[PDB]
Amino acid sequence: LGFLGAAGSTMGAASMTLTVQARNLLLTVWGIKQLQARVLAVERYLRDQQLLGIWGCSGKLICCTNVPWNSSWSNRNLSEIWDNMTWLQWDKEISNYTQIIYGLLEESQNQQEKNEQDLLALD
Amino acid sequence: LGFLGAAGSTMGAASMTLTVQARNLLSLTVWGIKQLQARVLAVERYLRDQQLLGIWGCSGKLICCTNVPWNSSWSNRNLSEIWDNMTWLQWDKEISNYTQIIYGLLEESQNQQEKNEQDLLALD
Amino acid sequence: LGFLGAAGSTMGAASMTLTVQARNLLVWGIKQLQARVLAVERYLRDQQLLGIWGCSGKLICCTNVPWNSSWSNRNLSEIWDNMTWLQWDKEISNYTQIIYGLLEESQNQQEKNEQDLLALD
Amino acid sequence: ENLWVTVYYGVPVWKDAETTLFCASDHNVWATHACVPTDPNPQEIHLENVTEEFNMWKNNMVEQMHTDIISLWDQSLKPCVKLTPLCVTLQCTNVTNNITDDMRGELKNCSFNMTTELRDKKQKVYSLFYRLDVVQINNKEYRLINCNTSAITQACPKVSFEPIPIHYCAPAGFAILKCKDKKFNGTGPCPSVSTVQCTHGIKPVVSTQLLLNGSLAEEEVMIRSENITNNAKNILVQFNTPVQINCTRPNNNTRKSIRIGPGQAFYATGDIIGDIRQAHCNVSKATWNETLGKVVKQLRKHFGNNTIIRFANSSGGDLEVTTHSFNCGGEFFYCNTSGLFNSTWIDSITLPCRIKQIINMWQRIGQAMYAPPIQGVIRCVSNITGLILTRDTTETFRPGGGDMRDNWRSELYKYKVVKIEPLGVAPTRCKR
Amino acid sequence: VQLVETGGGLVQPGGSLKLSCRASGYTFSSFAMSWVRQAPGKGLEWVSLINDRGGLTFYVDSVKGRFTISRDNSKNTLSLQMHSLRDGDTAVYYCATGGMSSALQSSKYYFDFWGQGALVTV
Ligand SMILES: *[C@@H]1O[C@H](CO)[C@@H](O[C@@H]2O[C@H](CO)[C@@H](O[C@@H]3O[C@H](CO[C@H]4O[C@H](CO)[C@@H](O)[C@H](O)[C@@H]4O)[C@@H](O)[C@H](O[C@H]4O[C@H](CO)[C@@H](O)[C@H](O)[C@@H]4O)[C@@H]3O)[C@H](O)[C@H]2NC(C)=O)[C@H](O)[C@H]1NC(C)=O
Ligand SMILES: *[C@@H]1O[C@H](CO)[C@@H](O[C@@H]2O[C@H](CO)[C@@H](O)[C@H](O)[C@H]2NC(C)=O)[C@H](O)[C@H]1NC(C)=O
Ligand SMILES: *[C@@H]1O[C@H](CO)[C@@H](O[C@@H]2O[C@H](CO)[C@@H](O)[C@H](O)[C@H]2NC(C)=O)[C@H](O)[C@H]1NC(C)=O
Ligand SMILES: *[C@@H]1O[C@H](CO)[C@@H](O[C@@H]2O[C@H](CO)[C@@H](O)[C@H](O)[C@H]2NC(C)=O)[C@H](O)[C@H]1NC(C)=O
Ligand SMILES: *[C@@H]1O[C@H](CO)[C@@H](O[C@@H]2O[C@H](CO)[C@@H](O)[C@H](O)[C@H]2NC(C)=O)[C@H](O)[C@H]1NC(C)=O
Ligand SMILES: *[C@@H]1O[C@H](CO)[C@@H](O)[C@H](O)[C@H]1NC(C)=O
Ligand SMILES: *[C@@H]1O[C@H](CO)[C@@H](O)[C@H](O)[C@H]1NC(C)=O
Ligand SMILES: *[C@@H]1O[C@H](CO)[C@@H](O)[C@H](O)[C@H]1NC(C)=O
Ligand SMILES: *[C@@H]1O[C@H](CO)[C@@H](O)[C@H](O)[C@H]1NC(C)=O
Ligand SMILES: *[C@@H]1O[C@H](CO)[C@@H](O)[C@H](O)[C@H]1NC(C)=O
Ligand SMILES: *[C@@H]1O[C@H](CO)[C@@H](O)[C@H](O)[C@H]1NC(C)=O
Ligand SMILES: *[C@@H]1O[C@H](CO)[C@@H](O)[C@H](O)[C@H]1NC(C)=O
Ligand SMILES: *[C@@H]1O[C@H](CO)[C@@H](O)[C@H](O)[C@H]1NC(C)=O
Ligand SMILES: *[C@@H]1O[C@H](CO)[C@@H](O)[C@H](O)[C@H]1NC(C)=O
Ligand SMILES: *[C@@H]1O[C@H](CO)[C@@H](O)[C@H](O)[C@H]1NC(C)=O
Ligand SMILES: *[C@@H]1O[C@H](CO)[C@@H](O)[C@H](O)[C@H]1NC(C)=O
Ligand SMILES: *[C@@H]1O[C@H](CO)[C@@H](O)[C@H](O)[C@H]1NC(C)=O
Ligand SMILES: *[C@@H]1O[C@H](CO)[C@@H](O)[C@H](O)[C@H]1NC(C)=O
Ligand SMILES: *[C@@H]1O[C@H](CO)[C@@H](O)[C@H](O)[C@H]1NC(C)=O
Ligand SMILES: *[C@@H]1O[C@H](CO)[C@@H](O)[C@H](O)[C@H]1NC(C)=O
Ligand SMILES: *[C@@H]1O[C@H](CO)[C@@H](O)[C@H](O)[C@H]1NC(C)=O
Ligand SMILES: *[C@@H]1O[C@H](CO)[C@@H](O)[C@H](O)[C@H]1NC(C)=O
Ligand SMILES: *[C@@H]1O[C@H](CO)[C@@H](O)[C@H](O)[C@H]1NC(C)=O
Ligand SMILES: *[C@@H]1O[C@H](CO)[C@@H](O)[C@H](O)[C@H]1NC(C)=O
Ligand SMILES: *[C@@H]1O[C@H](CO)[C@@H](O)[C@H](O)[C@H]1NC(C)=O
Numbered sequence: 001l002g003f004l005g006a007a008g009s010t011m012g013a014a015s016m017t018l019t020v021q022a023r024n025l026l027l028t029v030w031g032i033k034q035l036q037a038r039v040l041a042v043e044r045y046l047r048d049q050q051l052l053g054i055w056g057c058s059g060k061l062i063c064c065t066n067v068p069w070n071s072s073w074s075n076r077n078l079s080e081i082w083d084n085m086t087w088l089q090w091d092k093e094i095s096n097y098t099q100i101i102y103g104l105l106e107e108s109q110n111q112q113e114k115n116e117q118d119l120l121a122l123d
Numbered sequence: 124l125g126f127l128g129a130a131g132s133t134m135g136a137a138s139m140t141l142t143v144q145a146r147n148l149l150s151l152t153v154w155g156i157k158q159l160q161a162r163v164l165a166v167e168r169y170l171r172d173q174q175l176l177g178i179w180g181c182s183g184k185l186i187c188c189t190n191v192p193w194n195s196s197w198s199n200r201n202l203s204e205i206w207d208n209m210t211w212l213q214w215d216k217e218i219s220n221y222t223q224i225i226y227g228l229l230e231e232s233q234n235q236q237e238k239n240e241q242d243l244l245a246l247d
Numbered sequence: 248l249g250f251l252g253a254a255g256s257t258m259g260a261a262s263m264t265l266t267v268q269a270r271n272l273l274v275w276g277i278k279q280l281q282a283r284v285l286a287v288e289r290y291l292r293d294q295q296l297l298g299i300w301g302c303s304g305k306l307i308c309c310t311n312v313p314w315n316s317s318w319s320n321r322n323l324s325e326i327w328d329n330m331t332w333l334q335w336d337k338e339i340s341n342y343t344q345i346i347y348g349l350l351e352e353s354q355n356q357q358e359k360n361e362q363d364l365l366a367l368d
Numbered sequence: 369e370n371l372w373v374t375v376y377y378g379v380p381v382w383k384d385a386e387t388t389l390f391c392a393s394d395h396n397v398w399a400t401h402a403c404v405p406t407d408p409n410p411q412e413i414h415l416e417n418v419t420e421e422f423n424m425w426k427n428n429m430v431e432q433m434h435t436d437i438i439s440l441w442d443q444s445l446k447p448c449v450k451l452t453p454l455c456v457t458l459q460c461t462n463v464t465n466n467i468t469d470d471m472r473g474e475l476k477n478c479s480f481n482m483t484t485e486l487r488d489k490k491q492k493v494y495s496l497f498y499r500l501d502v503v504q505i506n507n508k509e510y511r512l513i514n515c516n517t518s519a520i521t522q523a524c525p526k527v528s529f530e531p532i533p534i535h536y537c538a539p540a541g542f543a544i545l546k547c548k549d550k551k552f553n554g555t556g557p558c559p560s561v562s563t564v565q566c567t568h569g570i571k572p573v574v575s576t577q578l579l580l581n582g583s584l585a586e587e588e589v590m591i592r593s594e595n596i597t598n599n600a601k602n603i604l605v606q607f608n609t610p611v612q613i614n615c616t617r618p619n620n621n622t623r624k625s626i627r628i629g630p631g632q633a634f635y636a637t638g639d640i641i642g643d644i645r646q647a648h649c650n651v652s653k654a655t656w657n658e659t660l661g662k663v664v665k666q667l668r669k670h671f672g673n674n675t676i677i678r679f680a681n682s683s684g685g686d687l688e689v690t691t692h693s694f695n696c697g698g699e700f701f702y703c704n705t706s707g708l709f710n711s712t713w714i715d716s717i718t719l720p721c722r723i724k725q726i727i728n729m730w731q732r733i734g735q736a737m738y739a740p741p742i743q744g745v746i747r748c749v750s751n752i753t754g755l756i757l758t759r760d761t762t763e764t765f766r767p768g769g770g771d772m773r774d775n776w777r778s779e780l781y782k783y784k785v786v787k788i789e790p791l792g793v794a795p796t797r798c799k800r
Numbered sequence: 801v802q803l804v805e806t807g808g809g810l811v812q813p814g815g816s817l818k819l820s821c822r823a824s825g826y827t828f829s830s831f832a833m834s835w836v837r838q839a840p841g842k843g844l845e846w847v848s849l850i851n852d853r854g855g856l857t858f859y860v861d862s863v864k865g866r867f868t869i870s871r872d873n874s875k876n877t878l879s880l881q882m883h884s885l886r887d888g889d890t891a892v893y894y895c896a897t898g899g900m901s902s903a904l905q906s907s908k909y910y911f912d913f914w915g916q917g918a919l920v921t922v
Contacts, residue, residue, distance in 0.1 A: 001411045004543065004563045007380040008417035011794060012904050016359075018378025019299045019351055021790055026288060026295075026540035029439065030402035031277045032155040037388045037539040038284050039162050044541055045291065046169065047149050048791055052377060054142045056800075058183025059303030061377050062358050064365045069371035069795040077369065081794060082904040086417075091381045091792060101373055101793050106142055112800075113186050114139075120188050156276055163283050170273050170290065178266045182304025230266055237307050238263075244309050360855045362374075362903045366797035369906065798903050 011090060012082035018061040051102070056109040066112065067104045073097040134214060135206035141185040148172075175226070180233040190236065191228045197221045258335060259327030265306040296347070301354040311357065312349045318342045371795035378790050385787035386428040387542050391436070392535040397444040398437070398572050399532040406535055407565060412546070414562045422547050424554040424781035425594040429536060433776050437572050438730050448524040449632045451738055455520075456480050458510040460502060463644070470646045470720065474499045478510060482634075485627050493626050495636030500687070500702075500724040514726055518734030525635060525740050529695050531581065533569025538785065547782040554592040554604075554781050570779045574729075575694045576769030577682070577705060579778055582753035584608060589662045592781065596670050599759045602768050604778050605666075610751030611659050615649040615696050615703070617723060617746040635740035637725075647721035649692075649703050651752070656708060656717060663755070664713040667765070676762040679709035682769075688731075689769040692719075697746035700727050700739060709767055731770055754778055801825035803895045803915030810921045815885055819918050821878040821895035826913075828876040829853070832900035834911065835869065835880050837891035845891070848880065849899050856900075862888075885922045892917040 003024045006014035025045050049058070057063030074081070074094050081090065094101075126147050129137040148169050173182070181187035197218055198205070205214065218225075250271050253261035272290050294303070302308030318339055319326070326335065339346075391403040424430075460478040467475075479494040502510045514520045523529075538544050544567060547558040573581045583606070590606040622638035664677045671677070682690050682705075691702040703721035727737050756775075758768040807819040819835070834849040847867065849858045854871035868881040878895055895915035901907040 001413055001563075001565070003413055004380045004382075004415060005413050007382075007415050007563075009380075014380055015376055015378075016355065017380070018376065019355065020378070021380055021788065022299065022378040023295065024540060024543075025788065025790060026292065027400065027402045027443070028152045028274065028277060030400075031281070032152055032159070033388050034390060034402075035159055035277070035280055035284060036155070037390065038288065039159060039166070040387075041539055041541045042166055042284075042287055042291065043149060043162065046166065048377065050145065050149060051791070052375065053183050054145060054185065055375060056183065057375050057377075059298050059301070060358070061299070062362055063375040063377075064362060064796070064798040064800045065373050065375060066800045067373040069373055074795070078371070078795065078797070078904060078906050087379050087381045087792060088418075090794060091379075091789070094793070098793075105373065105375065110139065110142065113184060117186055117188060152274065156274065156280065159280050163280060163287075166287055167273060167283065170287065174269065174273060177304050178269060178306070180304070234263070234266065237305065241307055241309060356853075356855060359853070360851075362796070362798050363851055363853075363856055363901075365799060366901065366903050366907070368799070796903055797901070797907060 007088065008086060010083055011085050011087055014087055015062070022061065054109060055102075055105040056112060065105055066108045067101070070097075073101070130212065131210060133207055134209050134211055137211055138186065145185060178233060179226075179229045180236065189229055190232045191225070197225070254333065255331060257328055258330055258332055261332055262307070269306065299354060300347075300350045301357065310350055310353060312346070312353050318346070369797070371797060372799050373793050374796040374798055376792050376794065379792040381789045381792060382543060382786035383789055385542060385785060387539065387785060387787065389429065389432060389536040389538060389785070392537045392566055393532065393569075395526065396528050396530070396532055398440050398534060400440055400443070403534065406569075410565060412562050412564045414548075414560075415545075418561050419557050419559045420545055420547075420561045420784065421556060422545075422552070422554070422558045422782075422784050423556075424592065424777055427777070427780055427784065429780050429783055429785060430773050430776050433534075433536070433570075433572075433780065434773050437772075437776075441729060442735070444527055445521050445523060445737055448527075449522040449628070449634065450519065451522050451628075451634055452519045453483050453628050454634055454738075455512055455515045456482060457505070458497075458502065458512075459508050460497070460510045461508065463496065463640075466640075466643045468643070468645055471644050474646070474722070475640075475644065476502055476510070478502065482626065483628060485630060487629070491626075493636065495624070495626070495634075496640070497637070498723055498725060500722060501726040512726060514736045518736050520726065520736040520738050522634060522738045523740060529698055531571035531573045533571050535566045535569050536783075537566035542785060542787050545784045545786055547784070550586045551588055551590070552782065553590065567780070567783050570776070573694075573775070574772065575692065575775065576689060577692045577756060577767035578613075578694075578752050579604075579754035579756065579775060580613075580694060580750045580752060582606075582751075582778055584610065584753055589659075589666045591663075591666045591670060602771075602774055603755075603757045603759065603765070604774060604781075605663055605755040605757060606778065607659060607753050607755075608662065609655075609659070610753055611651060611655050613649050613651050613750050613752050615647070615694070615701060615721065615748045615750065617647045617696070617699050617701070618645040619643075620745050621741050621743055623741050623743050637741040647699075647701055647703075647723050649701070649719045649721060650716045651708060651719065653715050653717050660711070661713070667763075671763050676712060676714050678712040678762055678764045680760075680764050680766050681706040681709050682767045687722075687724075688728075691722075692767070693769075694750075696748040696750075698739065698742045699723050699746055700725075705767060709765075712762075730772065801897070801913050803897065803913055805893065805895050805915045805918040808893075808918035808920055811885055813886055813922055817882045817885060817920060819880040819882065819893055819920070821915060823876045823878070823895075823897070826897070829873040830902075831897045831912070832902070832908070833871065833878055833895070833897050834899040835878070836894045836896055836911070837889075838894065838917070839891050847893075850878070851900055852902050858900075882920070885920075887922050890920060890922045892919055 002017065002020045004021065006017045026041055052058055124140055126143055129140045149165065176182055248264060250267055253264045273286065297303050300310065392406040393399055393403045394406060458478040458480050460476040462473060463475045463477050476497050476499065477494060478497055479492065481490055482493055484491040501513060503513045505511050544564050546562045546564050548560045548562055549558045552558055571581055585606045585608045589608055591603060593603045594601045620641040622641065624636045624638045625633045626636050627633045660679065667677055668675060684690060687702055692705045694701050700723065701721045702724060703719045705719055707717045707719055725739050727739055729737055756768040757765045759765055802824045804822045805819060807817065811817045829852055832850065832852050835847045837845045837847050847860050847863055848869040850869045850871050857869050859867060866884045870879045894917040896911040897913035898908045898911040
């Protein structure tokens with residue numbers, strides 16, 4: 001499989017196996033239990049894809065944005081984050097700022113998308 | 124404003140809350156089946172809307188511009204009235220009869236554009 | 248032509264009905280839910296696969312993977328003007344997973360390359 | 369530095385989660401059609417430089433299996449013959465033919481008036497019953513123990529009670545983590561964690577006091593408890609080597625089919641062929657003594673190098689918890705075990721066993737099941753792979769039992785269910 | 801750290817010359833690298849830049865259609881394929897480490913290490 005093989009790797013050693021994890025997301029009571037598990041997996045997948053969509057990251061695994069990084073979220077340089085830290089440690093480190101970052105991403109896409117509409121209205 | 128808060132606002136006041144409505148489209152065996160039917164239906168409706176955006180060349184966007192010209196036979200109004208006076212509910216009523224016509228044209232223009240793109244990355 | 252109407256048409260005679268067929272991918276009653284759930288998962292795997300190849304949102308997607316002559320040594324006219332998609336699917340079935348693997352690797356390199364071109368400044 | 373938020377999808381990050389697991393497997397109570405085939409080549413990916421905290425006492429996989437096993441049990445019994453028409457006054461006498469003293473008073477010959485194919489005509493039939501299944505009313509008048517608490521369903525004679533390995537497999541978006549840290553004590557950090565598609569096959573072996581046909585410890589005997597100093601908690605002991613136990617029901621039985629009504633029949637125990645002996649189990653004495661010595665040393669590691677450790681038989685209570693209960697060839701044995709826990713630490717052992725036909729499976733009131741007799745002579749050879757002990761200068765340990773969740777904890781202690789959180793963000797220098 | 805250039809020599813106008821650079825003392829695959837020219841009597845001129853992975857190459861306009869820059873991370877080497885040499889290409893060609901970045905590490909936009917240089921005479 002290779003699934004989660006990079007879990008113990010550093011952030012810059014990992015994030016090259018993104019398709020490995022991405023492809024692993026996809027008697028009446030037994031049928032119901034199985035359908036609930038399958039429907040839930042589908043709903044979670046679609047919510048994550050919708051979230052990437054509204055940020056302007058649809059169809060990508062590594063998506064660049066226009067949101068500046070705040071030093072209050074993590075006061076670390078790139079060498080520590082990408083060469084020493086793992087993704088599990090990073091997830092713990094910035095858990096409390098996740099929704100703030102997500103909100104900013106949504107707002108920047110809303111401005112960018114509208115700006116494109118105005119640029120395409122010239123001529 | 125929250126979900127549908129802009130429903131009574133004008134078209135140009137709305138079309139800035141699209142993520143608010145967009146995020147609300149995804150979220151004893153008889154009770155199990157009833158809940159599953161509700162969840163599966165919500166998923167299928169979402170995917171059909173996304174498929175339409177895909178085939179029109181609008182995947183990943185909430186606002187996308189196209190190459191289909193507007194016909195005066197569908198709505199003979201200028202932008203000042205449509206965007207500053209009208210609401211989206213009134214607009215939906217005004218062009219309901221032409222919805223499938225517009226959709227067909229959108230599909231057709233993407234089919235031409237996609238092929239046109241294929242014939243340009245072929246040069247050289 | 249409607250759904251599968253182009254099935255007997257040549258590869259270059261089809262490739263114009265892709266939206267027609269794309270539209271058709273979407274107690275005892277549990278059988279219906281199973282049938283509906285399966286269709287959704289199958290649809291999503293294909294969309295996910297297109298996503299990882301960088302072909303999301305498109306019906307025709309060009310890539311940077313060279314065609315290996317060992318997969319099919321034909322002259323393009325043979326493929327697109329005479330052959331149908333069913334015959335083609337049979338001809339290269341053995342190499343489908345090889346092609347898919349190459350497509351995934353190609354996109355990963357391009358995605359990293361794109362990132363490397365977006366902090367030059 | 370000028371850093372920008374970059375969004376990643378497919379990040380190898382997970383969080384603790386509780387979800388519904390499915391069942392994979394290779395006419396049977398548990399090998400049901402709902403379960404799907406296993407992967408012929410199971411995958412396991414070792415996670416290098418990963419330490420994950422495990423807690424076997426809060427593992428939702430144990431509760432799910434408990435519920436699923438009970439559900440499969442009831443679904444298996446649902447279509448079988450109901451024996452409500454059997455709850456009639458019995459006229460019982462003792463069986464005195466070729467009876468050894470060990471069996472004197474244990475087996476009764478009961479005659480009764482029961483219905484037949486037609487509702488109007490009745491028939492006089494007889495059946496042999498074990499003392500444990502029959503309660504005296506009002507010398508010769510008896511009733512079944514289930515008459516004043518619940519209707520009883522006869523188990524289908526064609527459905528095996530043999531445990532079949534069941535593998536639990538995660539749904540997509542979730543993962544099962546395996547603790548490969550030898551000598552893991554059931555709680556806390558576990559280095560050397562691997563990700564698997566599913567667990568190994570777990571046989572739903574039902575037993576008390578002694579754990580049969582389970583997994584063995586890789587190097588040392590393991591002593592595990594939620595709180596080792598709390599005498600209200602159970603101690604699970606995992607053996608390094610199995611102790612072989614040979615259990616038998618030596619009597620050669622036959623079976624009489626007595627029709628109750630259209631398409632329905634009760635299976636009565638017929639006359640016994642040959643001599644009547646009791647049931648028993650032979651536990652190798654030298655192996656058992658060595659096993660206890662190992663258990664005592666490991667207990668001393670927690671209770672003190674100079675603490676006297678004594679084994680004693682269980683305290684009183686229901687037969688299902690005071691004896692070693694198990695299903696051997698379709699018969700339910702209730703073995704004394706007192707001969708195994710009778711020593712102080714500082715040829716074989718023969719354990720007498722009783723057989724009962726009316727089984728209240730799972731600690732429930734009602735939903736009684738009647739086990740039909742099995743013809744011939746029953747012999748089982750099993751591996752004892754662990755113990756459930758309770759703690760009473762000197763510490764005393766006694767066999768424990770019940771709950772059933774502990775038997776499944778003894779196998780699922782190394783597995784954890786997590787959910788995948790594929791989205792994450794991180795600073796980079798890349799600007800859109 | 802060491803960077804040792806090889807190749808070089810005198811090639812007549814219109815010819816072709818391959819230069820190479822052997823690196824040691826650092827992880828080769830972790831740094832972007834470049835080739836820089838120094839005219840025999842003037843200053844330094846940047847010619848070409850290659851990323852750490854080798855997938856991205858950049859050239860100064862004066863050589864954009866004539867020079868190819870290549871990297872082989874399994875051998876710790878750089879190479880430069882110089883076609884259609886003209887009199888203006890006479891220079892010392894230095895192998896240098898630095899110049900670009902890999903996005904997930906701090907930027908450089910400077911040259912950390914230099915070799916001794918190959919002399920190319922047209
Ligand atoms: C720990 O694990 C061991 C295995 O390692 C278990 O031991 C086995 O236990 C079973 C049940 O007691 C033994 O019996 C076998 O039962 C099979 C199923 O019975 C069929 O046939 C009867 C016929 O009346 C039907 O009623 C029934 O519905 C089934 O259709 C039989 O098929 C087996 O027969 C095979 O083995 C015997 C060996 O004596 C041969 O003579 C046969 O020809 C045939 O090859 C058998 O009767 C089984 O034998 C035990 N295995 C071993 C190796 O001894 C333990 O029970 C388990 N412990 C616990 C507590 O579960
Ligand atoms: C089956 O039913 C018959 C009829 O009730 C029982 O026989 C009766 O037993 C009582 C005992 O006090 C006598 O007084 C009756 O005269 C008997 N009647 C007949 C017709 O025999 C018989 O005992 C029942 N058998 C069982 C096993 O309960
Ligand atoms: C069902 O009948 C049994 C058999 O009598 C009852 O068990 C007895 O309960 C009394 C009262 O607690 C005890 O003193 C006896 O020792 C029990 N055993 C026997 C053999 O009498 C049981 O309580 C009854 N249950 C119900 C719900 O009526
Ligand atoms: C357990 O061990 C006893 C011996 O202690 C076995 O009983 C013997 O069985 C043989 C059978 O051929 C007889 O000849 C002996 O006379 C028996 N001895 C005694 C003391 O009873 C018994 O069969 C064994 N049971 C199992 C399941 O292994
Ligand atoms: C059990 O009790 C019966 C008597 O109730 C014993 O006798 C047999 O009973 C059946 C009744 O169906 C008769 O058909 C047989 O003819 C009786 N036997 C004889 C010799 O007359 C029976 O033997 C007892 N069985 C045991 C194992 O004790
Ligand atoms: C674990 O750490 C060691 C430290 O020497 C390193 O060599 C190894 O590559 C690390 N594992 C992974 C998967 O990166
Ligand atoms: C970072 O967040 C704090 C609030 O927690 C805010 O005051 C500050 O201006 C932010 N800085 C940047 C650079 O976004
Ligand atoms: C998040 O906030 C809680 C307090 O509500 C604090 O205990 C925790 O450490 C914070 N986490 C981080 C990563 O700062
Ligand atoms: C409702 O109409 C008034 C003008 O009559 C306008 O000021 C107000 O903003 C409108 N409501 C919303 C939600 O836009
Ligand atoms: C507009 O629609 C009418 C039909 O109502 C059609 O005749 C006309 O050609 C259309 N014009 C354009 C520009 O599409
Ligand atoms: C749609 O057509 C019907 C006639 O079939 C007409 O009555 C109705 O008003 C039309 N709707 C619009 C919005 O023009
Ligand atoms: C079927 O084949 C004939 C030639 O044999 C061709 O003219 C015709 O167009 C084909 N059918 C379709 C649907 O293309
Ligand atoms: C083409 O396929 C053959 C057979 O797998 C392989 O040996 C060869 O290297 C491939 N060539 C290219 C350019 O992919
Ligand atoms: C595919 O492989 C089979 C052998 O498994 C072979 O018989 C068949 O000809 C192959 N097909 C192609 C198109 O190579
Ligand atoms: C069975 O034997 C016991 C002695 O063990 C005796 O007390 C009892 O009365 C006997 N019952 C019958 C029905 O003979
Ligand atoms: C298990 O070992 C850990 C040390 O790694 C200890 O903290 C914990 O209390 C132990 N638990 C038991 C039940 O012995
Ligand atoms: C274990 O039980 C004792 C009872 O006195 C209590 O003091 C102790 O805190 C408990 N430890 C745990 C880990 O629950
Ligand atoms: C169990 O029976 C086997 C014969 O099948 C015998 O070899 C073994 O020694 C017995 N074990 C015990 C503990 O009696
Ligand atoms: C059990 O083994 C110990 C030695 O570890 C020995 O002293 C003791 O006598 C043995 N007991 C029996 C019953 O063999
Ligand atoms: C108990 O004995 C072991 C040797 O088996 C020794 O290592 C340990 O230190 C002893 N502990 C005490 C408290 O004497
Ligand atoms: C435990 O053993 C003693 C001594 O033989 C006995 O009196 C007592 O009844 C036994 N307990 C049980 C529950 O059998
Ligand atoms: C187990 O055997 C002992 C032998 O002394 C006896 O006292 C005890 O009552 C027996 N227990 C059972 C449940 O038969
Ligand atoms: C326990 O050991 C003593 C030793 O004298 C013996 O008398 C007694 O019968 C034994 N009990 C059991 C149940 O083995
Ligand atoms: C039981 O007795 C019957 C008598 O016909 C015999 O055929 C059968 O083999 C015996 N079974 C055993 C296990 O002794
Ligand atoms: C007992 O464990 C041993 C371990 O080697 C195994 O070979 C044997 O088959 C097991 N016995 C049973 C009945 O499972």
